[PDB]
Design a binder for these strands. Structure first.
Ligand SMILES: [Mg+2]
Ligand SMILES: [Zn+2]
Ligand SMILES: [Zn+2]
Lengths: 113, 133, 436, 84, 49, 97, 49, 61, 147, 66, 140, 263
RNA sequence: UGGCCGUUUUCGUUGU
């Protein structure tokens, strides 16, 4: 009787931007990201890689409550790189890794049958 | 910069309950009456009975937020195969020369005996312990 | 209503003033109330279907009073027994027990997460208990990250040394766990626990925050580790079964000989009791002792991997007798303090012959639940359970009545400014409340 | 008669929790119904928050009248009371 | 009806766990917060809200 | 020596017994023989024993307040309709109970 | 059912008894005030006519 | 207002094409109750379809 | 079927929940704490026998006072290629990282209960009052007010 | 009542297989076998077809009001 | 047939096996009572089957000889508030409160007695795969 | 760097081996394809009339689970976003069923096959119900007896498995790694020993058991994931895999677009 | 054109 809309777990309201950044002023070169309409599916993937990078000092996130569809990511790269660049770099890296996996699977399925 | 050093023999190794962690009673080679009791992680740095070890206790590693260790930076540990950061929860001013120093590595405790001359400089807050090979 | 507003909250019966509190509002979907799993004890509540009621102030002065007088933090220590009333219970407790075992290690990325979960976290990672060859942390470090600054404590269990080979005993310095298996005895509602000190030292607000922080951290770690129970937890090696079987045989033989003597007017008469009563008391002591012995044997058999033992040690649930009954033996069934009566003619059940006094013949359940009871023993167990049910049903109403009478009696006594305790008229009952 | 002179006041000078709550609620009400504010407001639009801050500065114009058991009373100032 | 009475501005429901809430907070279904209400005097500090 | 049966006044005069310590479990005889204050102490001890036998504990001040209210007037104000209502307090009070 | 009422709790009427072996369910009974009063015939019970 | 208690559908929005009934028509934001779910949702007057003599008529009836 | 009554706290999509080696997920998740204190061994035995029946494709005989023992069930479950005590390795869902513990996992006979939540939810701002007393009425159905 | 569409646990559609299961049972094959030939390995599906009860025939055995 | 009064003076064998004296020592099964107070036994009746002593709401429970009796009683209690299919003709009957579970399923673990209670023909519960494990702390 | 090795392929079930990718990535792929694969299923059931013994809601539900061939759903826009007034044939595929029984004896059995496509944004291969074979009658929706008639006017739309479990194209994803527990991420319960109790996985031969003298590797990581996919038939397993990868890709691309646009 | 009215008393069953 007070359940949320199941279409709202992924759809975004207009007034709220998909992503929201908050610099973390209590330590240097640290940022906190306020996501929207996302969960472990995206957060875990982003975090794994952004941790694998060399110039990232601290990276973490958390799912506030499974009844709400958004999470917050903490990111703090060394002074060498601003966090935004590190995040988009990881984005590109996974993009290309997935593209490679897709291509290999396509070829493998073609040959297999 | 090393506040202590010695070479220790492993008299007895005991596992008992635990599996990944075990207790070793060691005695120094250079100076007897220096009895060492430490608890170490079998998988992370396996050992066995009758072993010999090089022990150091250095206040720092420079030759506050942590970070993964860059390969560019150098540290005293570079020549040892097991490091444990610690803090001293008790600096006993014991008997005539049975002075004991108590360091806890976040659950792994270390009780040490030795001459005041040997332990005079271990009255500190946080201590690293290094083991060669 | 908007978030953060103050509103009352209640359960029925409202036995002790820790059954009402003033909370804060958070708007959410679905049609149920939700409580932090810690505050269940003061409400003596559980989610097996229980219900709560609510109320709302309609004025600001009332909002002020609720905020300043009935907020949860101020209620943490119970003037009933000058001790903390809430505590870490169930999963958080049984988990933080394992998280603080000496031989649990946490790799870097998980620690990245957990350190961020703690809302009040300083934002400065602590250096690891290993910097080579692999950065590892021990749970104690993380659990400590929860405890705020400027905290002290200590405790000696079993007279252990400052080395603690058993890993018992608790020593906290500046709010950093130096060692010790943190569990009920340290974080329970009992006096002298961590919570007591945090309350008294940093005030209430920080003590409230502490529950949330520890809950978050230990819940997260348990999630990424997880815990379960299974039937094997209620089974032991065949050798222990042989031991316990022979112990049972010995106890039965002892009772046999006790009966043989009592038959022959050779059994010594206990002062203040007759032949039959002393005979029954002796046999009951024998059977209880045999049950306890077999239970301790089965208990010492258990490995530390067994989940049942892990819960018992953690203490968030269960007790030794539970294990003894499940695995070793149900034991003797007692009714109104006496063995099973001879409801029939000179016997308990018609299946046995007349005048049998042996344990089974008057309500000794030989096997354990895992083996499964025999019919007669099942019936005896049913008698015992029904008796317990009746006792609870009767006792509840009488206790309610007595509490009502008392509350009505003292309802007017209050403490004036002069420091004297007077009822309405002005009679003085204590010149200085409680004499202090 | 029922009053007692400030030289001989005997009651405790600390402000009891009940006095705190009553003064806070009273002031916050008055504040919330167009009463003047004796200290600055910067971001705390909540009248209760205003009252809390004003008490923290000891700038609240209210006198507690405590009643002795007999019937006599004494007058303490919210200014003078030692707030913990 | 004098020592006790049925009162206004109340609500009843079931309870459920919530490891992710504060100690002094409580899940409150939306419908109730929509039903109950609290008077609020008009000041310059909340006119817009 | 422990006994079944209560006779407080007579036993203290039996030779061979410390007459300064002997205690009985029926605080009514304590009131009858050893006055009121002894009654207060015996009552408190009995309540404390009853509660604590299981293993529980209660702050002493509360039980002290209970007893000292019970015997404020000087006689056992047994907590029922009789004793409470027999108090000369306001009618509205004793009526509701 | 049992026409023993509830004015005065007692326990002899409510409790189980040895003779019940094989005539009433040792497992079934309601909860609360009726606990122990309302019984149920065993799975081979039979009533004399 | 003669535009109450009539079957109404949604042409645009997250519930595109759901039969609903006008329960409350205070003004400029019509409260319409649906059938598939057990709930009523507000919705602007111009995001609905109104049944008419023939076919479905938008907000001009 | 053994008194382990309980409610539903929150629900999880298919992915977030743990899955066994075979890709299964469990329908429902209960608290281990509830079992040991209550000594409901029959619950565990039923789960075991239900697992055995499902794999071997027939219903089990759980008549009390018989010769069946957990030994036979363990033997069958092992012969059919499973842990002879019904444990089954599970994997986290939020990451897929294994679970350091081995979960007990099987089909158990449940049965929904009549006390739906919405039958009990209630509110009251203002409404009918007893004419005799000018006090709010009693009962949820009549917009009553709680005592 | 009626064989469900999708297995609650996994989601492997099963309802269509019910008739085939009855058919296989007809000639006396043991139930485990029949469940095999349908290719139902995860017992999360075996539980249904083994222990579903058909009621819709019972409910139809009453003459409809039409 | 026999009643309680007639039972007063009859010696029964728990099962047909006892009618013949038995002669092993398993570590995981129940053990019979010693029954050694009468070295000579002359039986006159033998129980049909011990499980017959239960009630209708009690035979639904599997392995009732493996539980703490109050749990048996609790289970008996709620057994009567379990949604399900009470009567085939619910459609034609038109009562005040009646509920039906979409897809009732018989219990995988039956007690032999449920044949005559028709439970396997009219169940009131499902067979669900449940994982007994602290997953995320919401199941406390 | 990422590799692939299919072990057994088929229309529905894929049993492959994925290696050399972050375990986070394999898990997120599993999740996304379980949850975030756009598909087509019945959405609005409009019942002209019914005479069955099954509640109208009961049928509407049963239809909700019917798998629809959605091989071209990727072309179909979201009904939420489509600009048409009411639905259109470019944002909705209309299916209708009207079955009946006649005669006083026997029982009819309306199956999924009796469903019919009325319209749809053709010739996009969408709307058709799935079947194992041609003669395979298929899913059983109801049974009808004398005079009982069933008529319905269904609708489908493009939703995602998040919004309901009918949009799930995946049935049961197997998943595992380290069949011998080299990384030790699990501690094995036992009564006597770990090895003589726990039976071995089916991938046992795919990685050699650790040598008795072998010692722990503290830098070891999970590398080889063996994930065996299956489907209801609404989409080919290869299509499932490729579409999941594409969806995850475009999602990250959206995120990166947001990042760059924010400045 | 605002304004606006739905029983009691029993007994039962249950729930925490
Ligand atoms: Mg309860
Ligand atoms: Zn399945
Ligand atoms: Zn369209």
């Amino acid at each position: 009787m007070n359940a949320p809309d199941r279409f709202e777990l992924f759809i975004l309201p207009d007034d709220v931007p998909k992503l929201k950044i908050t610099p973390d002023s209590r330590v240097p070169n640290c940022i906190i990201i306020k996501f929207e309409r996302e969960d472990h599916t995206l957060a875990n993937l982003l975090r794994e890689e952004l941790a694998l990078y060399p110039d990232v000092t601290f990276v973490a996130y958390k799912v506030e409550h499974p009844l709400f569809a958004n999470f917050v990511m903490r990111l703090q790269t060394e002074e060498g790189t601003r966090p935004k660049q590190a995040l988009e770099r990881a984005c590109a890296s996974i993009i290309n890794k997935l593209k490679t996996l897709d291509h290999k699977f396509n070829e493998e399925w073609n040959i297999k049958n | 910069s090393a506040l202590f050093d010695d070479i220790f023999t492993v008299q007895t190794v005991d596992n008992g309950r635990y599996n990944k962690v075990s207790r070793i009673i060691g005695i120094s080679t250079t100076n007897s009456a220096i009895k060492l009791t430490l608890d170490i992680n079998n998988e992370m740095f396996p050992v066995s009975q009758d072993d010999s070890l090089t022990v150091t206790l250095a206040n720092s590693l420079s030759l506050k937020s942590w970070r993964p260790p860059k390969p560019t930076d150098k540290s005293l540990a570079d020549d040892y195969d097991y490091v444990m950061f610690g803090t001293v929860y008790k600096f006993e001013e014991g008997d005539e020369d049975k002075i004991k120093v108590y360091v806890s590595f976040g659950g792994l405790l270390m009780c040490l005996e030795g001459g005041y001359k040997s332990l005079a400089s271990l009255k500190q807050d946080n201590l690293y312990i290094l083991i060669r090979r | 209503l908007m978030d953060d507003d103050p509103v009352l909250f209640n359960r029925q019966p409202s036995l002790h003033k820790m059954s009402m509190m003033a909370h804060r509002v958070k708007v959410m979907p679905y049609s149920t109330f939700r409580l932090n799993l810690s505050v269940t004890s003061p409400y003596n509540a559980d989610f097996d279907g229980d219900e709560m009621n609510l109320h709302v102030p309609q004025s600001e002065e009332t909002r002020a009073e609720l905020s300043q007088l009935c907020a949860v933090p101020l209620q943490i220590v119970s003037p009933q027994s000058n001790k903390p009333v809430m505590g870490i219970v169930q999963d958080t407790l049984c988990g933080v027990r394992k998280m603080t075992l000496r031989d649990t290690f946490i790799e870097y990325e998980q620690v990245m997460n957990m350190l961020f979960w703690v809302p009040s976290w300083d934002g400065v990672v602590p250096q690891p208990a290993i910097l080579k060859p692999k950065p590892l942390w021990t749970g104690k470090q993380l659990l400590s990250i929860a405890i705020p600054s400027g905290i002290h404590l200590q405790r000696t269990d079993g007279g252990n040394s400052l080395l603690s080979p058993k890993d018992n005993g608790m020593l906290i310095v500046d709010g950093k766990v130096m060692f010790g298996v943190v569990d009920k005895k340290t974080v329970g509602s009992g006096g002298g626990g961590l919570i007591h000190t945090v309350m008294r030292e940093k005030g209430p607000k920080i003590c409230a925050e502490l529950f949330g922080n520890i809950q978050k951290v230990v819940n997260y770690w348990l999630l990424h580790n997880g815990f379960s129970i299974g039937i094997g937890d209620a089974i032991a090696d065949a050798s222990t079964m042989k031991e316990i079987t022979h112990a049972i045989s010995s106890a039965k033989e002892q009772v046999q000989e006790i009966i043989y003597k009592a038959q022959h007017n050779e059994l010594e008469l206990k002062p203040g009791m007759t032949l039959r009563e002393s005979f029954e008391g002796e046999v009951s002591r024998t059977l209880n002792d045999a049950r306890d012995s077999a239970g301790r044997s089965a208990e010492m058999n258990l490995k530390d991997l067994n989940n049942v033992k892990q819960m018992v040690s953690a203490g968030s649930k269960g007790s030794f007798i539970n294990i003894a009954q499940m695995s070793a033996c149900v034991g003797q069934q007692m009714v109104e303090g006496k063995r099973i009566a001879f409801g029939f003619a000179d016997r308990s059940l018609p299946h046995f012959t007349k005048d049998d006094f042996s344990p089974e013949s008057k309500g000794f359940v030989e096997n354990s639940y895992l083996r499964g009871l025999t019919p007669q023993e099942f019936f005896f167990h049913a008698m015992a359970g029904r008796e317990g049910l009746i006792d609870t049903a009767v006792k509840t109403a009488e206790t309610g009545y007595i509490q009502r009478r008392l509350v009505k009696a003292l309802e007017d006594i209050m403490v004036h400014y002069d420091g004297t305790t007077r009822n309405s008229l002005g009679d003085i009952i204590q010149f200085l409340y409680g004499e202090d | 008669e029922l009053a007692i002179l400030k030289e001989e006041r005997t009651t405790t000078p600390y402000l009891t929790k009940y006095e705190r709550a009553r003064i806070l609620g009273t002031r916050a009400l008055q504040i919330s119904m167009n009463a003047p504010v004796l200290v600055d407001i910067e971001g705390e639009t909540d009248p209760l928050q205003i009252a809390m801050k004003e008490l923290s500065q000891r700038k609240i114009p209210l006198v507690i009248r405590r009643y002795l058991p007999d019937g006599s009373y004494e007058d303490w100032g919210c200014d003078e009371l030692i707030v913990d | 009806n004098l020592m006790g009475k049925r009162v206004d501005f109340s609500a009843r429901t079931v309870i459920s766990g919530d490891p992710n809430l504060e100690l002094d907070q409580v899940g409150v279904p939306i419908s109730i917060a929509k039903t109950l209400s609290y008077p609020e005097t008009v000041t310059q500090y909340n006119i817009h809200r | 020596l422990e006994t079944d049966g209560i006779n407080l006044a007579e036993v203290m005069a039996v030779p061979g017994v410390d007459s300064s310590r002997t205690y009985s479990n029926s605080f009514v005889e304590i009131l009858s023989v050893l006055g009121i204050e002894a009654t207060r102490s015996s009552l408190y001890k009995e309540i404390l024993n009853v509660i604590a036998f299981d293993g529980s504990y209660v702050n002493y001040r509360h039980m002290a307040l209970l007893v000292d209210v019970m015997t404020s007037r000087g006689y056992l104000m047994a907590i029922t309709r009789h004793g409470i209502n027999r108090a000369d307090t306001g009618a509205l009070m004793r009526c509701s109970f | 059912n049992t026409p023993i009422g509830r004015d005065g709790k007692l326990a002899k009427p409510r409790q189980l008894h040895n003779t019940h072996w094989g005539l009433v369910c040792p497992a079934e009974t309601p909860e609360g005030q009726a606990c122990g009063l309302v019984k149920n015939l065993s799975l081979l019970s039979g009533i004399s006519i | 207002d003669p535009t109450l208690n009539k079957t109404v559908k949604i042409r645009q929005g997250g519930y595109k094409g759901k039969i609903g009934i006008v329960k409350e028509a205070n003004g400029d934001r019509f409260r319409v109750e649906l059938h598939n779910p057990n709930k009523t949702i507000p919705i602007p007057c111009s995001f609905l379809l109104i049944e008419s003599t023939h076919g479905w008529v938008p907000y001009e009836d | 079927r053994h008194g382990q009554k309980g409610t539903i706290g929150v629900t999880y999509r298919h992915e977030d929940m743990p899955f066994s080696a075979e890709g299964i997920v469990p329908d429902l998740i209960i608290n281990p704490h509830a079992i040991p204190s209550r000594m409901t061994v029959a619950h565990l035995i039923e789960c075991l026998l239900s697992k055995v029946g499902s794999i071997r494709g027939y219903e089990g005989d759980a008549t009390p006072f018989t010769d069946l023992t957990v030994d036979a069930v363990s033997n069958l479950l092992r012969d059919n290629g499973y842990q002879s005590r019904g444990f089954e390795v599970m994997y986290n869902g939020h990451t897929g990282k294994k679970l350091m513990a081995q979960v007990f996992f099987g089909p158990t006979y449940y049965q929904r209960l009549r006390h739906m939540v919405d039958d009990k939810i209630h509110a009251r701002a203002r409404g009918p009052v007893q004419v005799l007393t000018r006090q709010p009425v009693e009962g949820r159905s009549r917009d009553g007010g709680l005592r | 009542m009626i064989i469900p569409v999708r297995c609650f646990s996994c989601g492997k559609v099963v309802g269509d297989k019910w008739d085939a299961y009855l058919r296989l049972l007809e000639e006396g094959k043991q139930e485990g076998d029949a469940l095999d030939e349908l290719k139902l390995k995860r017992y999360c599906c075996r539980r249904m077809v083994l222990t579903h009860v058909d009621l819709i025939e019972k409910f139809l055995r009453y003459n409809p009001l039409e | 047939y026999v009643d309680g009064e007639e039972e007063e003076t009859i010696m029964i064998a728990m099962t047909p096996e006892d009618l013949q004296t038995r002669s092993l020592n398993d570590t995981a099964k129940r053990i019979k009572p010693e029954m050694s107070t009468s070295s000579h036994h002359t039986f006159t009746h033998c129980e049909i089957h011990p499980s017959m002593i239960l009630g209708v709401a009690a035979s639904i429970i599997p392995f009732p000889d493996h539980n703490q009796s109050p749990r048996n009683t609790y289970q008996s209690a709620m057994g009567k508030q379990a949604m399900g299919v009470f009567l085939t003709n619910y459609n034609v009957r038109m009562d005040t409160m009646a509920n039906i579970l979409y897809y009732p399923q018989k219990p995988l673990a039956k007690t032999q007695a449920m044949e005559y209670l028709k439970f396997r023909e009219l169940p009131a519960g499902q067979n669900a795969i449940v994982a007994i494990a602290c997953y995320s702390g919401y199941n406390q | 760097e990422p590799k692939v090795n299919i072990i057994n392929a088929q229309d529905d079930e894929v049993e492959l081996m994925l290696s050399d990718v972050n375990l986070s990535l394999a898990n997120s792929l599993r999740r996304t394809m379980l949850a975030e694969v756009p598909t087509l299923a019945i959405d609005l059931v409009e019942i002209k009339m019914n005479t069955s013994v099954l509640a109208d809601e009961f049928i509407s539900h049963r239809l909700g689970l019917i798998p629809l061939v959605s091989e071209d759903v990727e072309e179909m826009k979201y009904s939420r976003d489509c600009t048409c007034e009411d639905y259109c044939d470019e944002c909705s595929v209309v299916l209708e069923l009207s079955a009946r029984h006649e005669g006083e004896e026997g029982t009819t059995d309306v199956y999924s096959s009796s469903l019919i496509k009325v319209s749809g944004p053709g010739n996009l291969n969408v709307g058709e119900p799935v079947r194992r074979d041609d003669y395979d009658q298929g899913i059983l929706l109801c049974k009808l007896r004398n005079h009982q008639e069933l008529n319905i006017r269904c609708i489908a739309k493009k939703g995602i498995a998040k919004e309901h479990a009918k949009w799930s194209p995946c049935s049961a994803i197997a998943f595992e790694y380290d069949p011998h527990n080299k990384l030790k991420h699990t501690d094995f319960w036992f009564e006597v020993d770990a090895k003589k109790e726990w039976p071995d996985s089916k991938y046992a031969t795919w990685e050699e058991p650790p040598k008795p003298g072998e010692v722990f590797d503290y830098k070891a990581k999970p590398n080889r994931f063996y994930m065996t996919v299956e489907t209801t038939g609404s989409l080919k397993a290869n299509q499932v895999f490729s579409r999941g990868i594409k969806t995850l890709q475009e999602k990250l691309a959206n995120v990166l677009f947001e990042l760059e646009n924010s400045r």
